Each structure stands twice: as C-alpha cells, then as structure tokens.
Design a protein around this ligand. Structure first.
Ligand SMILES: COC(=O)[C@H](Cc1ccc(CCc2cccc3c(C(=O)C(=O)O)c[nH]c23)cc1)NC(=O)C[C@H]1CCCN(C(=N)N)C1
Length: 123
C-alpha cells in the first residue's frame, strides 16, 4: 500500500541523515576527533520496533550539542526529530530503557542506522 511506502521512505530518509552525519566524521581533524569521541551517548537496551525510536529522540539534544561543537545542526536535528515523530507517532506511551554502557557517537549512529535497516527489511 501507500501507507507502508510512506513509512519506508521515512525510514530511508532517517537512515540517510544518520549516514550523512557519520560520513562527516571521516573528515574531522585529529585534535577535534579525539575530543568528540569522549562525548558519550546512551544506547537503547532493545530497539527493534518503531516505538523504540523515542530512545533516539531523547538523544537528539546531545547529538545537536556535539554537532555544534564540531562544525546548520539545529535544522538537521529538527528535521530528524520531525521524521522520528512521524514514524512512531505521539499516541503510544513507551518509556525508553537504556543499557548501562554509554557509547561514542560512531557506535550510536551505527546502532540507529542498523535499526533503520532492520525495520526497512521487515516491510
Ligand atoms: C560527564 O560528562 C562527560 O564526561 C562528557 C564531557 C564532554 C566531553 C567532550 C565534549 C566535547 C567536544 C568536542 C566536539 C567537537 C569538536 C571539539 C573541539 C574542537 O573543535 C577543537 O578544539 O579541536 C573541542 N572539543 C570538541 C564535551 C563534554 N560529556 C558527555 O559524555 C556527554 C553526555 C553527558 C550526559 C548527557 N549526555 C547524553 N548523551 N544524554 C551527553
């Protein structure tokens, strides 16, 4: 249907934005890179369903913060939040469970990229 296709395009969009941020990291210089890798992100214990996207939404602020230091990020992140809101909706009440171990921005982006590919595959 067109409802599922709309969802699929939204996920492809979110995945692409995440991948673009990740690719940007390849160009950051050394002093800069080292500092940024010590900024920690919180990871979802389980992220296999759209509702789990709240675990990404709550981490968008810290994401914006680090992206501003390493440089518009305000616009990009806002756009990602819009996609996330569209995908999980605001009707479902789910509370995010985070793992104990925090992670670098690289692992954080990789995990959400995998999440996006995982949902896309089930469609
Ligand atoms: C207790 O706090 C900590 O140990 C660290 C501290 C910290 C570590 C690193 C940084 C920054 C970053 C940075 C990024 C990009 C470029 C640069 C930079 C340069 O450009 C340069 O001068 O070369 C200097 N510093 C930079 C800012 C804060 N902060 C974090 O780990 C951030 C999390 C803290 C809790 C809430 N957070 C969350 N994910 N929910 C974020």
């Amino acid at each position: 249907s067109s409802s599922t296709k709309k969802t699929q395009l939204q996920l492809e969009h979110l995945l692409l934005d995440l991948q673009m941020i990740l690719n940007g990291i390849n160009n950051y210089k050394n002093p800069k890179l080292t500092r940024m890798l010590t900024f920690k992100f919180y990871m979802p214990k389980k992220a296999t369903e759209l509702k789990h996207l709240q675990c990404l939404e709550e981490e968008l602020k810290p994401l914006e913060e680090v992206l501003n230091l390493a440089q518009r990020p305000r616009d990009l992140i806002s756009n990602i939040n819009v996609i996330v809101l569209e995908l999980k909706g605001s009707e479902t009440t789910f509370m995010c469970e985070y793992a104990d171990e925090t992670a670098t921005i690289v692992e954080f982006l990789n995990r959400w990229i995998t999440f996006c590919q995982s949902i896309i595959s089930t469609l």
